[PDB]
Amino acid sequence: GIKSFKHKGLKLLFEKGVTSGVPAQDVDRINDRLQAIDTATEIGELNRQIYKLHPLKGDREGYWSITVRANWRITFQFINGDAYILNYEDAHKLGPEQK
Ligand SMILES: [Cl-]
């Protein structure tokens, strides 16, 4: 299950169904991906082709990234069947050394 959030907008959506903290056009895709992350027992179960699942690097080693739309990513740590530090991030703000 999802145990924690860094991004308040994601948290608000996941917990309350309130969409004000994410882009409105991304709500359905974000709900689907959060549900997938919340259900997964193993990181490998999130490896649907369209998610483009990949681990991050450097200071972000230990985090994972899946695609929502274009450059937007849901990122998280995944350990012992749970997900932590859920965030919604722009991939272009990552340096080459971090991906
Ligand atoms: Cl939290």
UniProtKB/Swiss-Prot annotation:
GO biological process: negative regulation of cell growth; negative regulation of cell population proliferation; negative regulation of translation; plasmid maintenance; RNA catabolic process
Keywords, comma-separated and alphabetical: Endonuclease, Hydrolase, Nuclease, Plasmid, RNA-binding, Toxin-antitoxin system
Active site residues per record: 92
Example of a GO MF term: mRNA binding
InterPro entries on file: HigB-1, RelE/ParE_toxin_dom_sf
Site residues by UniProt (Interaction with HigA): 14, 31
Top-level taxon: Bacteria
Assembly notes: Forms a complex with the antitoxin HigA which inhibits the mRNA interferase activity. The heterodimer dimerizes to form a HigB-(HigA)2-HigB tetramer that is able to bind to the DNA.
PANTHER family: TOXIN HIGB-1 (PTHR40266:SF2)
Function: Toxic component of a type II toxin-antitoxin (TA) system. A ribosome-associated translation-dependent mRNA interferase. Inhibits translation by sequence-specific cleavage of mRNA. Prefers either in-frame or out-of-frame 5'-AAA-3' codons (lysine). Also cleaves the first three AAAs of stretches of four or more A sequences. 20% of codons containing AA are cleaved and occassionally cuts even at a single A.
Name this protein carries in UniProt: Endoribonuclease HigB
